[PDB]
Design an enzyme around this catalytic site. Structure first.
Site: not given
Ligand code: NAD
Ligand code: NAD
Ligand code: NAD
Ligand code: NAD
Ligand code: A1L6Z
Ligand code: CL
Ligand code: CL
Ligand code: CL
Ligand code: CL
Ligand code: CL
Ligand code: ZN
Ligand code: ZN
Ligand code: ZN
Ligand code: ZN
Ligand code: ZN
Ligand code: ZN
Ligand code: ZN
Lengths: 334, 333, 336, 333
Positions: A151, A178
């Site tokens: 992001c 953030h």
């Molecule tokens: N502001 C943000 O949240 C943001 C922005 C851009 C990118 N990202 C990136 O995108 C990714 C996810 O971000 P997030 O905020 O949604 O975190 P999150 O914790 O919400 O995403 C994890 C999700 O995937 C599931 N999961 C966990 N382990 C798993 C597995 N082994 N197999 C399948 N599913 C699994 C979780 O139970 C959960 O539903 C991160 O790498 C994060 O840094 C996040």
């Protein structure tokens, strides 16, 4: 014509990529894997969202599938990504949004179950990294495993591109203030690898390392080694801001800066880089789909070569929309 | 111990008084506040959401506020001119209201028979001090003086060490600031500063600040070399300064750490702190330093261009400085 | 004679702005004038357009030729501290929404009649004005009543639920807590509140107990419950949406499933739009911008026995109430 | 002083340790956590966002955690049955992990040579105790016990005083409770308890609780006469109980205040507090009472139907009760 997509990890980004795909119609979600959210739970988690409100559409469980706006989605519950039957479900691209499979080796597990391409929803140590509007035309069909960066990188890189294209960035240091994220804790808890990130997210301003500014030098190779920075996590649930302090190669009055950013926002970076002179605050960008919105009134110049530029980003919704945009562009090149 | 009076019993008034009684460096004898009667003063001084209950005793006795057994006189007097200070035995007097920041409007305390006035805020046109930076530039000729702002007190001690050792060519500062009393709970009116009206729990709020320019008034050599801005965020206390600066002489980050550490243990002891611990904002709650350098949080791009992080409890650090200033003005009498 | 009533708003605040937003969204009344000595015209554009809680206004809003123009409709703007000096009649405002919080008696609210308003609707409890809750006693309004009150957000949450429980089972006695979002009366950090000390304490850091007459007021809009209810509030650090917790003793035995049946029936029929019903696993943010006065949360409540129960109902304290002000004014118009 | 082992150095384990060193009532000699290494224990114990820096010393030394000069043996066992409590000299074990709350699981500490186990949470099968209410029912036959919850420890002492004096026919409790470690920062997975997954900063969250029903176990006369529910709200510590009860005998509100105030000064001193001050939640941060009756906040409909309000620092009160229960157990042998 629309690429069929599978989502690994139905989290903030997994759910909002799904939401973005159904809202935009740019890709078709056909499969979701999440071992920690069963089918009936997915309906609830997708329908109700504390940050972005109730889903505008229909969601229900029918015949062991998740049905969004009448469109049935195969649901998997596999911890091991190499065991997910993407090919059987018809998922051609996989969004890798768990946070735990970010190397090409780990993300490449999805190829074993029949995915054609993988888009990592995070920075990668080794995958090619893309920011829509900045380097997405460097994508080619030989790249099966790619990263949409972070992001923060998606906020900084469109602004950095404009400044660098017009005046040159000699060097830059970035701070991002953030919003809290799922990786943080409600009260002081364990984070053995990153002690400060264990401390209570509601109570604290928390300094954190980020590679997001360094990463801009990978998506804009002329800026390799010329940027770095850090973050403060603060207690808001969504929307973040970049503060870029940079030295310019060629002199620019602050009104010159405003003019080129506004022109970029209205033309080639339309929908990616926004531009405002309004008296905005973070909640004004809740559910805003831009990658980056430059805040003319918030920045300040010391002189024609040394400036601080401010840009807002809905870290959830801008990025999620970019993941969908990237996959649509990839599909157009097949 | 000089005998001191306070106009306003707001956050700064109360915390100066708190610092005065905790340090025992000076001794409070009078207070003035129209929006606040005696019984209410007891409650506001005794209980504090941010810093906890006062360690000591506080009571209303014979129409005086009594703290740790010390009677204090209580005026309600709506106009500063009309403030019988000399009556009460108030040598020096703290202007904590912050609508009397100018030297004329705050001269008014001289009318009530008060000797010297320390203002608890930036002034348009009064001599600003920062302990550890230019307080040794106080001589007796001086009446109405300023102690600057909380943020200037955080930034100036660090800027002094960095300039003294490496030279600051130029710098741009961000402060990420806890919420203050001028903010609103929900979106409400702030006609001169629209962003400041927007709900303080819900928002990151950009704001103007003169704190970095002001450093150029207490450190003349940095005049015109610094500016900055702020973000208000929804924490209740403790703020941080993020100074991005270009240095004349090259400095490895480990050299920056070495000089800040030396200064914190030596002449800026008690003023400028130094830590390498994995700290977060709440670790500085009720910390009496002006500025604490966070070694691990800062980052260098190269030997000439660095981002330096320093924490301050905006309430508590500053309040202790206002007391420290008066203890030092007392040794010059 | 009277069609779509023309409205003036005194105090362009959370409720004054969201009443304006509700009027333009529903179309039930026409806003023609606004008075706020603390928000000039250019600033009204900004404060109406951007809202931290409810998002950007879905429409157009601008300043032109000294008017506020919303969805192309020009609104006359006044800047008077003294409500007797507002020229409502000249601007065409027939009913005035008194939403400042400082003119809540019939005598103080009646100032608006001096500038040519016809009726006044006080957006708060009143010590002496007739009080109304849509769905509960609005049919008791008559055109002899020129100054009235729409009660509080909390009374509008409790009363529709209390009506249904009382009608079906009989309330012997009840005690209510509301866990309520912070409001503009509170402070960001510990500051002066000379008459209500706890209310001065920092709103973001504290749970803050507060008195409220909202439960006792239900006995005024539902006379059979007079003297049978009271309660109190805790303010907590959320920006919007509140919840009522009603503990009551019932005259007739009521299985929890029976309570759910009659509430659901009321939500689907006579109190549609006013009282909602859910069995979903909701939390407060799920009601952000929800226009109901009261949404019964089936899963959150609990029965000790067939005569003694704790009933939970959610309310968007800003948006439900603002919609109710509009609804009541359109009802008043229909009875001219 | 009895020697104590703490299984789990999460918030409870840490604040029990802090209570122990602060009170001196027991001697902590060992801590087990497979997940949290020694250097990280130092950091987690010294710095606390809610309660401030530890008042004392803590350091790693010779593979032990040393608090106020007292070395503590550190274990990193996944399997409680393998922890060598006996060799470290730990007689009682505080089972604070949250995942070994049954007698079968908690009782594994006996395999390593612990003599008694105190589960710092409700148990499905271990007998539950609340100090001031049923701790005199503890006896030496009970090797594995529970200290109930923070909410039961708040409600039971107030319920006891009211029942003893007026009789509780029936009562329903709401607790407005600060966030805890089990909640999430943003909407996340909580598959057994969907509302608890929702963002803790953003939401009021209703939750089931057996805390009120449990009062009927520590006060058997109230079996089936009490239940309730919770709202989690976005504050970081301090909670409040709202008890709505019907009384058998008439009681003027002023009679309620008198008997609670007398109880607070006599048998329930340090456990049940009493205030008429104009308090808010933060005034109870770091307060070691189980329950502080807020006289001003409660309200009576009539002589037979009242709403009573009582504050509790869910962290500090409960942690102090775990230490006090262990001291009471030690008194029996
Ligand atoms: N502001 C943000 O949240 C943001 C922005 C851009 C990118 N990202 C990136 O995108 C990714 C996810 O971000 P997030 O905020 O949604 O975190 P999150 O914790 O919400 O995403 C994890 C999700 O995937 C599931 N999961 C966990 N382990 C798993 C597995 N082994 N197999 C399948 N599913 C699994 C979780 O139970 C959960 O539903 C991160 O790498 C994060 O840094 C996040
Ligand atoms: N949750 C709620 O906010 C809520 C819900 C229901 C009812 N109410 C009631 O509605 C009233 C307003 O509520 P609010 O939350 O919007 O408070 P508010 O502070 O936002 O409303 C005050 C507004 O009126 C303006 N105003 C103040 N004094 C004025 C005057 N003398 N003349 C004209 N305008 C003036 C203010 O500058 C401000 O714009 C209160 O009585 C309140 O209790 C509020
Ligand atoms: N009654 C029940 O059935 C039940 C269920 C779950 C939790 N709990 C208890 O948890 C209590 C205290 O919570 P807290 O706020 O300190 O939580 P916390 O998360 O802050 O503390 C838990 C700690 O235990 C440690 N831990 C986890 N597994 C461990 C293991 N196998 N061995 C050793 N240590 C381990 C973690 O490092 C963590 O630091 C109460 O909420 C509640 O009584 C009770
Ligand atoms: N240069 C600046 O940045 C600037 C600008 C305006 C004000 N100020 C000042 O305002 C203060 C803000 O700090 P704070 O946390 O103490 O805010 P605060 O709101 O808590 O302080 C105000 C206190 O003084 C009392 N007060 C108000 N008017 C008074 C009067 N006429 N006479 C006597 N007492 C009066 C208030 O009722 C209140 O108790 C200063 O610290 C300083 O910031 C500074
Ligand atoms: C308290 O707070 C309760 C029990 C949490 C949830 C709850 O509140 C009312 C009814 C219920 C079911 C605690 O869990 C405390 C925990 C850490 C914070 C948390 C709020 C303390 C320190 C605790 O002792 O852990 C054991 C326990 C079940 C209760 C507890 O007090
Ligand atoms: Cl929506
Ligand atoms: Cl060099
Ligand atoms: Cl919207
Ligand atoms: Cl302390
Ligand atoms: Cl009786
Ligand atoms: Zn040049
Ligand atoms: Zn203290
Ligand atoms: Zn000196
Ligand atoms: Zn019966
Ligand atoms: Zn009608
Ligand atoms: Zn007293
Ligand atoms: Zn005992």
């Amino acid at each position: 014509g629309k690429v069929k997509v599978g989502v690994n990890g139905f989290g903030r980004i997994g759910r909002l990529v799904t939401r973005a795909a159904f809202n935009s119609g740019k890709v078709d979600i056909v499969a979701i894997n999440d071992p920690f959210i069963d089918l009936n739970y997915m309906v609830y988690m997708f329908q109700y969202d504390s940050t972005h409100g109730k889903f505008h559409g229909t969601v229900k469980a029918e015949n062991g599938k998740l049905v969004i706006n009448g469109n049935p989605i195969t649901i998997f519950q596999e911890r091991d990504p190499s065991k997910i039957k993407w090919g059987d479900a018809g998922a051609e691209y996989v969004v890798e949004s768990t946070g735990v499979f970010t190397t090409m080796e780990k993300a490449g597990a999805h190829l074993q179950g029949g995915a054609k391409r993988v888009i990592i929803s995070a920075p990668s140590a080794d995958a090619p990294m893309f920011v829509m509007g900045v380097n997405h035309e460097k994508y080619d069909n030989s790249l099966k495993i790619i990263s949409n960066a972070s992001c923060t990188t998606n906020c900084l890189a469109p602004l950095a591109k404009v400044i660098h294209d017009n005046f040159g960035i000699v060097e830059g240091l970035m701070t991002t203030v953030h919003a809290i994220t799922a990786t943080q804790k409600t009260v002081d808890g364990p984070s053995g690898k990153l002690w400060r990130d264990g401390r209570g997210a509601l109570q604290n301003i928390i300094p954190a390392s980020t590679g997001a500014a360094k990463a801009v030098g990978k998506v804009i190779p002329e800026l390799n080694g010329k940027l770095t920075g850090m973050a403060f996590r603060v207690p808001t649930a969504n929307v973040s801001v970049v503060d870029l302090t940079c030295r310019l190669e060629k002199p620019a009055k602050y009104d010159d800066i405003k003019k080129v950013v506004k022109q970029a926002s209205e033309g080639p970076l339309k929908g990616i880089l926004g531009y405002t002179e309004h008296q905005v605050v973070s909640s004004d960008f809740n559910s805003d789909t831009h990658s980056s919105t430059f805040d003319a009134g918030a920045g300040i110049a010391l002189n024609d070569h040394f400036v601080k530029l401010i840009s807002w980003y809905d870290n959830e919704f801008g990025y999620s929309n970019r993941v969908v945009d990237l996959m649509a562009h990839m599909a157009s090149k097949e």
